[PDB]
């Protein structure tokens, strides 16, 4: 807290930042617990205030009983809150939230298959696409079309993409079958 106070009131002095890098881990650990607010000082100047926030109070804050209540409070004050009624209502809500968090602490006592079938379908279908290269039947067509024929070339290229589309249909069918297996 002392280091944070010094750093915020004097950001210019480099030696203080040197101490800050020396103590980054301490400040990083104490950041969740550290509280920081700005109040109107007794000497007509805004003064920052530092305090300790307890982990239990924090956890009660993230508990939903806080969340719905603060939803309602914000919704009310933003709409029908006057200049001074805003702030008094904020204080009243703070006290009510304090009570209900005490109550919460009292009451407290102490797609995988989709990704994974999709992986199976994709690996299977692409491996079937390369099963043609494994059979090695393009070298014979190669030897037949040693000669120069753009028509045969465009037909062969269109056949390869034709079967890439066929492969897409097999993938869609496998996805549909998986969906059926999961829904049934």
């Amino acid at each position: 807290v002392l280091l944070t106070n010094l750093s915020e009131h004097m950001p210019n002095d480099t030696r203080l930042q040197t101490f800050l890098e020396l103590a980054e881990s301490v400040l990083n650990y104490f950041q969740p617990f550290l509280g920081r607010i700005e109040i109107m000082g007794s000497a007509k100047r805004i003064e920052r205030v530092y305090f300790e926030i307890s982990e239990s109070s924090r956890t009660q804050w993230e508990k939903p009983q806080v969340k719905e209540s603060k939803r309602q409070f914000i919704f009310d004050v933003v709409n029908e809150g006057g200049e001074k009624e805003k702030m008094e209502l904020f204080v009243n809500f703070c006290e009510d939230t304090i009570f209900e968090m005490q109550l919460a602490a009292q009451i407290s006592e102490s797609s995988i298959l989709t990704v994974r079938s999709a992986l199976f379908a994709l690996r299977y279908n692409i491996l079937t696409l390369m099963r043609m290269l494994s059979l090695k039947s393009l070298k014979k067509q190669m030897k037949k079309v040693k000669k120069m024929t753009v028509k045969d070339m465009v037909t062969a290229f269109f056949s390869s993409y034709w079967s890439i589309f066929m492969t897409l249909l097999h993938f869609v069918a496998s996805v549909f079958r998986g969906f059926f297996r999961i829904i049934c």
């Binding site: 509280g35 607010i37 700005e38 000082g41």
Partner: protein, 96 residues
């Protein structure tokens, strides 16, 4: 109009902070300025945490600012809360 009021409330949060009401435009000069002003400089959660800290702390152990705020809170005086101001605005000439 009910939908419009809900959207109005949400975008009023997005534009201005609750505690002092200064719009995001001033804080927006520095990156994530409004976000920082919301989570540490002006945080409703932080103010509530300060209130519970005052309530849980002994009367003897209160500091000067803590006792000032506690006295004003008991007398139901809300002047200690900032009004259209913050540390950044107060010390803008030195800090920036």
């Amino acid at each position: 109009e009910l939908r419009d009021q809900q959207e109005q409330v949400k975008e009023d949060m997005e534009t201005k902070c609750f505690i002092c009401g200064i719009g995001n435009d001033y804080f927006d000069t520095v990156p994530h300025g409004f976000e920082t002003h919301t989570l540490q400089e002006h945080n409703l959660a932080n103010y509530l945490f300060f209130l519970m800290y005052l309530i849980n702390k002994d009367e003897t152990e209160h500091t000067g600012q803590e006792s000032y705020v506690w006295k004003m809170y008991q007398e139901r005086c809300w002047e200690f809360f900032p009004a259209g101001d913050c540390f950044r605005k107060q010390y803008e000439d030195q800090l920036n």
